[PDB]
């Protein structure tokens, strides 16, 4: 239909981010969430290079696109824009591991390299030595921050998708460590957890959303990205999540004003690990992850995605470079977005810091 616009990309991806948050939140409640919805969108987009028929349809439509949409040069442009050196410098592992007895079409290897900067490997799939080789590659690609990604590996495995990312960003406005004090984080009515509370009093873009009974605060990162922290009022989190949509976000963006805030933010490390087959099953991307998948653009041989893992890790600390109180001493949501593109890089929920 002609390559889709950057604006189409920004809209399809952002609706995919939120819909994916909403499924994760419904699936595993009361657990820490952290994923990179743009990493996932890109990996599915990459795989769609080699998908045909309903397999191809289910991917695009699940990504937020018309069935006949042409998305590749748009994704290519978006990615090179995120990966600019004035960016976050996210080192990420994105690998495709396929049975070595299968001959891969050249058009796929070239097109996934150039467009998506994604690496494909033909591999012998002995359950043990293969998991070693793959986990070791992710380790290298992520500078050792993500070890042992794969837990186990079935002998009849034909195709493994691996998507891993570790993020530790630098604040535009850094907390002074001297202000950091142990405080109670109230996980729920009956659970308390002791946490280093970072504190800072300054000017931040802030909004108190009465409609949704939550506060919203923006923390700028070094590298033209920002964390939007959403703190619900007492006993409101679930309703806040139900009302968590692209239209709410933009409403929040127009509504933030630069205000003097007293800010209390815990230093924390969270993690998400996801099986893309069960996570995407409700988003309607099913055929791809089962024996009758049409991946005849990848190989003429019968083929499907046997295993697909996304893992994302986030460290938050103090480094480095009437008034309202924003005290995050109970579960809260956040997302990290790219300023230039509006891209939702990460989304998360801190329940157990």
Author numbering: -4 to 316, 330 to 361
Task: List passages from the publication reporting this PDB structure.
Hypothesizing that a serpin reflecting a highly conserved sequence may offer insight into the delicate balance between folding and function, we designed conserpin (consensus serpin). Conserpin (396 aa) shares the highest similarity with α1-AT (137 residue differences; 62% sequence identity). Characterization of its function, structure and folding reveal a serpin that is inhibitory, folds reversibly, is thermostable and resistant to polymerisation.
The crystal structure of conserpin, confirms that it adopts the archetypal native serpin fold. Comparison of native and latent state conserpin structures with available native, latent and cleaved structures of α1-AT545556, plasminogen activator inhibitor 1 (PAI-1), α1-antichymotrypsin (ACH), neuroserpin, antithrombin and the thermostable serpins, thermopin63 and tengpin reveal that despite having the highest thermostability, native conserpin has the fewest H-bonds and salt bridges. The rigidity of hD in conserpin is probably due to a salt bridge between Q105R79 of hD and E376346 and interactions of the N-terminus with hD. This network is significantly extended in conserpin, compared to α1-AT. Specifically, the mutations of T339E310 and S292K264 contribute to a salt bridge network spanning s3A, s5A and s6A with K191163. Conserpin contains three mutations in this region; Y187A159 and G115A88, which allow s2A to more tightly pack against hF, and Y160W132, which further improves the packing density. Although native conserpin features fewer overall number of polar contacts compared to other metastable serpins, new, specific interactions stabilise a rigidified native state that is less frustrated than α1-AT.
